[PDB]
Amino acid sequence: TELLKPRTLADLIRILHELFAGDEVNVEEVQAVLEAYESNPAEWALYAKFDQYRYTRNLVDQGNGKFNLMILCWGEGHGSSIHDHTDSHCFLKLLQGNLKETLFDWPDKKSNEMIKKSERTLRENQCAYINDSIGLHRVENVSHTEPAVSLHLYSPPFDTCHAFDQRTGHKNKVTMTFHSKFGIRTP
């Protein structure tokens, strides 16, 4: 339970393996360790594979089945749907640039406009946390000039979620795909 500052991305991953050795998750400790890693672009360049048209998901570590650790690369103006997290913990740490996170409540069964609960600007090295009990979110790179790169940890791993129609609250199941795994493009 003794948390030390990760010296490198590799060191962070080693620490994460320790933190997820059991069946439960100390959220505050995981967030603190992620926050404490100082982004070093040389260490994650291998995973930072962008697409011109949308954000990409790049698998870094499979957490011996306990978690997926991945790097997401957001071109200028790229963003996500309003989505849930499939009964998993979700940690988001900025490695480069800024992202806007908008929070939404779970919709009622009635067809209605989903109104923003709040928004914040997540900045370099900051780590946010979300789960389904907190609500839904959208994550966007609103920059016109700066690509963003973020480090995401989901536990347990999941490869499907829901996207919500902002106009109605209607949801559709979506399958998440990986752009690359362990530095290797996986078309």
Q: Which residues are known binding-site members for Fe cation?
A: 83, 85, 137
Please answer whether residues 162 and 82 qualify as being in contact, where contact means their C-beta atoms are separated by less than 8 angstroms.
no
Structure tokens at 111: 């067809």
Q: What angle do CA 139, 150, 58 make, to 5 degrees?
A: 105
Which secondary structure element, helix H or strand E, spans residue 151, and what is its range? Answer: strand 148-155
3-class DSSP state for residue 89? Answer: strand
Burial 8-28 (b: 16+ CB within 10 A, else e): ebeebeebbeebbeeeebeee
- Binding site as annotated, residues: 83, 85, 137
Please answer whether residues 54 and 141 qualify as being in contact, where contact means their C-beta atoms are separated by less than 8 angstroms.
no
Q: Number of helices (H) and strands (E), helices first, in the chain? A: 3, 13
Concatenated DSSP letters of 90-118 = EEEEEEES-EEEEEEPPPPSS-----EEE
Please answer whether residues 74 and 148 qualify as being in contact, where contact means their C-beta atoms are separated by less than 8 angstroms.
yes
